Design a protein around this ligand. Structure first.
Ligand code: HG
Ligand code: HG
Ligand code: HG
Ligand code: HG
Ligand code: HG
Ligand code: HG
Lengths: 246, 246
């Protein structure tokens, strides 16, 4: 066998196993790949860190969050840094069930000061500030995240949870591209989550259904807005499920 | 926005979020993708099922194994069938903590009779027969799996657990490509797992270390073979960790 053939076979294993949920085979292959003799700023850094990132993500997928974080201790790409902090955050929360929280906040603030604008890090800064009850800051980070990654649902959801009134909701929406379908979807979600649904929400929802006529998510939104106007029954689901928290 | 642009943006979200472990954003994007108007035998079937597979895998990654299985109820590619059965198997085991076990065995046997030779299904048949204590059958399926997918670690591990003597171990190894590095690695693992380590195991291990000199896995194997001849100390780790069961 050629070295490059072995590498390629391990890499194809990783892909086929991760697609099928076989996280232990992925972890083993990633360990072996990393054990071989070694063979714009961000993209280069991601290529350089690719093997070590694969190993850290395999641990993360086995729920080894401490080990994933430690694996990434030397890495510098924004992708690596995100997984490292998100690992630390989940490992701190596993153990709560958060000693790591202040640490994560400081790393994120240094990153901001340095001028990092990676949308996944901006999302974690958002989550951190919301949890510190710093809502104005949370909103400003999450808006910056969804401007860059408008199809990233979890940022829009955290944005909605950072917003405490329809007035604040209309202020934020006034700063987002009003034509963009995700802005429309967010508006519907956040109006319902605030329980302040007017006519515009129904209009926006009808627009989103033209593009996604059979979405389980939008069907739920429609059922919720229908209850708002006042087999499965949406009222008998856990509301955490209907709100997409679970 | 073009329809194809929206689709492409959702697909790029899925990739970037799944790489970072953001399973909830992936599930939302997969639901939306599947809600759009719709737009050798196996490869074709995988292309056809690709969207629905993405949705089922997103549920599987959120630990929604029943829902993943139900999502795949109409699918026919071997990849889809594997995830469906593996979901059912994990959902049956979650609930044990297995009503699904007999059902999975029957689907796998029909598949075998039909002449399916997908190595991931052959692995699940292996796991099923081993658990029925049908070791000869387990071995025959797992050998067929690793002949097709020799870098798939979990099949080699299940093969080792199906083997109860060095004599059976030497019978099986006599049927595998003796030159192939994974055969060598398996031999080392299975000899230690049997506690029947002779000189050949040390030889095979030394050969594997030429290619993977810094593998965490092989370092552990070396420490274990060293204990066999009789910072971290391998004797104080959980043996389930050292044996790669966890
Ligand atoms: Hg290969
Ligand atoms: Hg593989
Ligand atoms: Hg690194
Ligand atoms: Hg996009
Ligand atoms: Hg995205
Ligand atoms: Hg299907």
């Amino acid at each position: 066998m050629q070295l490059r053939e072995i590498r390629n076979c391990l890499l194809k294993c990783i892909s086929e196993c991760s697609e099928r949920g076989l996280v232990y085979a992925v972890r083993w292959a990633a360990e072996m790949l990393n054990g071989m003799n070694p063979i714009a700023n961000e993209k280069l850094l991601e290529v350089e860190e690719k093997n070590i990132y694969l190993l850290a993500k395999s641990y993360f997928d086995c729920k080894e969050f401490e080990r994933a974080a430690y694996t990434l201790q030397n890495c510098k790409s924004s992708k690596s840094i995100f997984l490292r902090l998100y690992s630390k955050y989940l490992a701190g929360e596993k153990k709560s069930e958060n000693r790591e929280f202040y640490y994560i906040s400081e790393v994120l603030e240094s990153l901001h000061y340095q001028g990092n604008k990676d949308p996944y890090l901006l999302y974690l800064s958002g989550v951190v500030y919301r949890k510190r009850k710093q809502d104005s800051k949370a909103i400003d980070f999450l808006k910056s995240c969804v401007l860059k990654a408008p199809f990233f649902w979890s940022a829009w959801l955290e944005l909605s949870l950072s917003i405490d009134s329809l007035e604040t909701l209309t202020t934020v929406v006034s700063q987002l591209p009003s034509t963009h379908i995700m802005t429309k979807i967010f508006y519907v979600y956040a109006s319902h989550e605030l329980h302040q649904v007017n006519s515009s929400a129904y209009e926006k929802l009808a627009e989103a259904e033209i593009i996604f006529p059979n979405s389980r998510y939008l069907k739920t939104q429609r059922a919720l807005l229908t209850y708002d106007s006042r087999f499965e029954n949406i009222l008998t689901n856990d509301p955490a499920e209907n709100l997409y928290f679970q």
